[PDB]
Amino acid sequence: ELAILKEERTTTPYLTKYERARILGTRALQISMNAPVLVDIEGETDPLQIAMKELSQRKIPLVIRRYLPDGSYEDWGCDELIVD
Amino acid sequence: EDNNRIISRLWRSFRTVKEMAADRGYFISQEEMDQSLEEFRSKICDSMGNPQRKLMSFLANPTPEALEKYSDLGTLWVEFCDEPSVGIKTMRNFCLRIQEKNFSTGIFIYQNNITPSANKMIPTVSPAIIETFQESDLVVNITHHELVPKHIRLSDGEKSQLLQRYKLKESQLPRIQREDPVARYLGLKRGQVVKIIRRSETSGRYASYRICL
Amino acid sequence: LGDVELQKELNSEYEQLVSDRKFLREIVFVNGDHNWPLPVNLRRIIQNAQQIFHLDRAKASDLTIPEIIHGVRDLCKKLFVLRGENELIKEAQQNATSLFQCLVRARLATRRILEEFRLNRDAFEWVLGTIEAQFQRSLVHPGEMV
Amino acid sequence: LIDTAVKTAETGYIQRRLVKALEDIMVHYDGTTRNSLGDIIQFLYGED
Amino acid sequence: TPALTVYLDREIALDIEKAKVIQSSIEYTTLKNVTSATEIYYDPDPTSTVIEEDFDTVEAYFSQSPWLLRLELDRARMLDKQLTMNQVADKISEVFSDDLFVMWSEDNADKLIIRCRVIEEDQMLKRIEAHMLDLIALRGIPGISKVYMVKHKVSVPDESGEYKNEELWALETDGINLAEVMAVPGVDSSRTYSNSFVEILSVLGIEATRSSLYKEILNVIAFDGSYVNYRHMALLVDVMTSRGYLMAITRHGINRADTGALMRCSF
């Protein structure tokens, strides 16, 4: 009804600064609550740095729902948005 | 002397009225466009030199392009009145004549003032449309000013396209007053959308859209 | 020397440049000012390309004219401020990047690329890709409290 | 000293009024600049 | 400080005498501006006089109420405004067509005088004198109290296409009347500008109002060499002109919007 098909998605293909900040915060909070970790944890123990490692390797299992001013929205998985 | 100045100002106002009509889409003969001050004085003035404002009143028909585009474009009547103050009498005659020959739009150019009692007949004369301008206002064509970019009224289909492209409602657009000098000059009715292309120092060119209230 | 099926492209380039000249002089900047804040510093890109690809010894350049012209033409059609196949979307996209396209074409001209900057093919491709990426990075993010 | 002591109140009032006037304006995912009512202020931010 | 910048037509814009004539045409002078001192004389007989200077003038002017007004016109004030006796007397008769009969001494006369007759009336004369001194115009646009002959270093392309400075006269003013000055012949009607953007809105529309608003804000900010990026002032002027009319940054502007009650109360 308000979801947009993956073909006519006309928002930016790039992760914005706010989306990146909130995604990292949410992933860090999740990992600090003994959530499973998708990357191989080698040296670092801080949940924020682990979340950054996951973000770089496109392994954060989250979805951004971008609301338009008319109420409709587009859904983008974190692994398909482009990270600078 | 001052007679020359009065005649020149009246001729400038007449040229502005013709430019207004042609801009709005009506066909005007190219020779009546280039009407010169002396030739105008020949065709209008008297032996005493004072001008008959009853000969300037002309009739304009829609150019075929402005008919294919603005399907709601009827036939235009333009009258320069002789009474400086205009009352309910003169408006009654004007409205009777406009409805009498099914003229869609009647422009009533006056000199001094149009009284509110007369002013009340302007909206009550459906389905015809009566607009008024003051001669002092028409001396300069303001659409030629450098700060006034070119306004182009959209058609119904293009207005719908504009609203759907932005997923917009009519009330969520920038707005223009019906009494705006460029809306007044263009004969904008409520709900019609002009497109305003203008200079942009950051991007070169920028298109703006306003809905007339 | 003497070719025609290439002089056509050279004339197309020069006519686009004259169009930009006329546009900027008569509509946008009538008083002649030509130093304006714009995204993506092209001077720095060109000099970085020279440093990275070692453009000394004025070596014979393997960068053909049609490839230069088509590279800049393709680049000008890859700077996306608005995405969508709509028609007003296309109009707004071209209105958005007209001044920046004027800049990119004033700098990456065929004579300038070949003589003034003496770029080879690698430095040229690097300049185009860097302009692409840095322009995509200069855009405002949705959510800004502007 | 009088200028420094006295003008700061007018300046702070001006900045408060500007902030209240422009506080609800955001760039949206379609590029437009709209207020809280959804009304368009600029069709593209900064026109570029 | 209201002010217009009246750009002249190019033929005028290079010549200085023509520009000064346009200045004279655009500037506002009233009968107050050229009058020294007014008297009231009892002159019982219109064909004779009790005075000793103007008897010869009216004996050369001949071959109603006995209340006379004898107003005097200083020399230099007439000289500087290109005004003579003929135009002034005509202007008085313009609004006192037939309820007043005007006598005027000649211009070379050792005393520059005007005499008028009404057609107990020692106070209607005073009322008429006050209304003349305070409402009779001579030439120019009302609302323009001063005009200046200013020089603008415009940069225009040469015949070789290269940009070169060019020295043009233009007019700056005290007061504002955009519509009437825009019409005056000799003025570039497409380039007259006002520092009051309310006037711009009333005359030129809302887009010109946005342009004028940006120009004023940029002037105020960039006065001291400060540089604010364009987009911020563009946003500020777009918020102020978005509804079709000028929205002030006040409660009277902000709180007349359609936003929620909690926002408006919070301000």
Side-chain angles (χ1 to χ4, degrees), chain A residues 19 66 69, chain D residues 28-29 34:
Chain A
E19 312 185 299
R66 300 162 152 190
Chain D
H28 290 257
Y29 272 94
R34 310 196 193 191

Side-chain angles (χ1 to χ4, degrees), chain E residues 79-97:
Chain E
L79 184 67
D80 177 56
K81 316 282 196 168
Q82 304 174 15
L83 280 170
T84 180
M85 185 64 72
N86 208 322
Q87 295 163 355
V88 163
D90 299 346
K91 281 288 191 178
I92 305 175
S93 302
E94 287 320 281
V95 296
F96 273 119
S97 186

Side-chain angles (χ1 to χ4, degrees), chain B residues 30 80 92 103 177:
Chain B
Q30 320 310 108
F80 293 71
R92 201 178 74 244
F103 287 137
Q177 288 182 348

Side-chain angles (χ1 to χ4, degrees), chain B residues 2-206:
Chain B
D2 189 79
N3 190 358
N4 290 318
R5 183 178 182 270
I6 295 170
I7 295 304
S8 170
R9 294 178 64 88
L10 167 55
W11 158 71
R12 299 177 82 192
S13 313
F14 187 32
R15 188 178 61 211
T16 309
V17 159
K18 268 178 284 194
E19 285 157 353
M20 176 174 321
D23 266 334
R24 292 169 67 153
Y26 297 96
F27 187 84
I28 295 286
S29 53
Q30 320 310 108
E31 63 184 1
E32 265 302 306
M33 272 294 210
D34 317 307
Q35 187 69 42
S36 69
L37 162 58
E38 184 64 26
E39 167 170 296
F40 181 76
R41 194 186 204 119
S42 307
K43 293 187 287 184
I44 305 286
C45 292
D46 277 337
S47 59
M48 284 73 74
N50 285 131
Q52 271 90 15
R53 292 180 179 90
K54 291 177 70 68
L55 277 81
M56 294 182 286
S57 306
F58 68 94
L59 188 153
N61 288 318
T63 319
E65 290 95 338
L67 209 64
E68 295 196 283
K69 190 161 197 58
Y70 311 132
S71 308
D72 69 292
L73 188 62
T75 184
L76 182 63
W77 185 254
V78 175
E79 183 178 1
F80 293 71
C81 178
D82 273 321
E83 282 174 7
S85 288
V86 160
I88 193 66
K89 175 184 307 272
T90 313
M91 294 299 291
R92 201 178 74 244
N93 314 111
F94 184 56
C95 294
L96 178 56
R97 199 163 144 78
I98 293 288
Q99 270 165 309
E100 194 175 339
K101 293 187 286 185
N102 53 35
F103 287 137
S104 285
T105 300
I107 301 176
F108 198 83
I109 303 102
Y110 72 85
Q111 299 168 189
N112 267 350
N113 68 354
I114 183 154
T115 187
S117 60
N119 201 5
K120 287 321 185 195
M121 183 171 305
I122 280 166
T124 194
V125 69
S126 43
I129 308 153
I130 303 303
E131 319 164 18
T132 81
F133 299 84
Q134 183 177 1
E135 275 198 2
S136 313
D137 299 10
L138 282 167
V139 174
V140 181
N141 189 359
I142 55 165
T143 61
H144 293 344
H145 212 282
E146 53 173 355
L147 307 188
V148 184
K150 195 171 178 185
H151 300 52
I152 296 170
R153 154 159 89 98
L154 289 191
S155 64
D156 269 324
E158 281 178 339
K159 150 163 172 170
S160 177
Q161 192 165 318
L162 167 77
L163 294 175
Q164 312 152 1
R165 177 259 175 294
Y166 284 113
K167 288 171 177 172
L168 262 187
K169 296 183 290 294
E170 281 180 8
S171 67
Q172 299 188 314
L173 270 157
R175 291 164 181 181
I176 191 161
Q177 288 182 348
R178 262 196 56 210
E179 309 316 301
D180 195 61
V182 186
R184 221 193 55 231
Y185 165 96
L186 275 180
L188 290 177
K189 318 183 209 77
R190 293 298 183 90
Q192 302 175 322
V193 168
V194 291
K195 166 173 190 177
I196 304 155
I197 316 172
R198 74 197 191 201
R199 184 190 91 72
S200 176
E201 80 183 8
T202 49
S203 66
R205 185 178 269 129
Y206 180 72

Side-chain angles (χ1 to χ4, degrees), chain E residues 34-48:
Chain E
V34 294
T35 309
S36 72
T38 73
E39 303 164 338
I40 282 179
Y41 284 164
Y42 181 70
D43 189 339
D45 202 22
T47 61
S48 179

Side-chain angles (χ1 to χ4, degrees), chain C residues 16-26, chain E residues 160-162:
Chain C
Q16 178 64 280
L17 269 48
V18 174
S19 296
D20 292 358
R21 169 63 170 263
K22 192 177 299 186
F23 172 49
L24 297 159
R25 281 194 164 200
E26 300 211 358
Chain E
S160 56
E162 184 254 332

Side-chain angles (χ1 to χ4, degrees), chain E residues 24-166:
Chain E
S24 63
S25 194
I26 282 176
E27 197 182 329
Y28 193 47
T29 62
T30 47
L31 182 46
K32 185 177 180 180
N33 294 109
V34 294
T35 309
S36 72
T38 73
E39 303 164 338
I40 282 179
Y41 284 164
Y42 181 70
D43 189 339
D45 202 22
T47 61
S48 179
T49 181
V50 191
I51 317 309
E52 304 166 357
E53 303 158 348
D54 307 326
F55 158 82
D56 295 329
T57 297
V58 296
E59 292 302 316
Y61 179 56
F62 269 78
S63 300
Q64 48 193 351
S65 172
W67 278 130
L68 181 65
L69 191 156
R70 194 186 179 273
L71 63 94
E72 171 152 350
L73 308 177
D74 191 76
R75 182 172 313 282
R77 289 204 171 184
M78 295 296 172
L79 184 67
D80 177 56
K81 316 282 196 168
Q82 304 174 15
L83 280 170
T84 180
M85 185 64 72
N86 208 322
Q87 295 163 355
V88 163
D90 299 346
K91 281 288 191 178
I92 305 175
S93 302
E94 287 320 281
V95 296
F96 273 119
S97 186
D98 285 333
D99 299 316
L100 186 67
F101 189 95
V102 185
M103 283 74 74
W104 42 271
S105 80
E106 268 195 356
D107 298 70
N108 289 317
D110 305 332
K111 268 198 174 193
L112 314 184
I113 317 287
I114 294 191
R115 282 162 83 101
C116 305
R117 290 196 169 288
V118 178
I119 288 168
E120 198 280 330
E121 301 187 324
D122 191 62
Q123 300 301 109
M124 283 73 74
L125 206 50
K126 280 169 194 158
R127 274 200 303 252
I128 286 180
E129 180 260 349
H131 170 263
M132 294 183 286
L133 265 179
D134 204 3
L135 207 45
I136 298 309
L138 306 150
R139 68 183 66 187
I141 301 299
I144 307 302
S145 303
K146 271 303 297 292
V147 188
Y148 312 114
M149 185 64 72
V150 189
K151 182 62 66 68
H152 280 127
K153 292 181 181 179
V154 70
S155 167
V156 293
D158 200 8
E159 308 95 19
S160 56
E162 184 254 332
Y163 282 89
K164 64 90 176 179
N165 303 317
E166 186 163 78

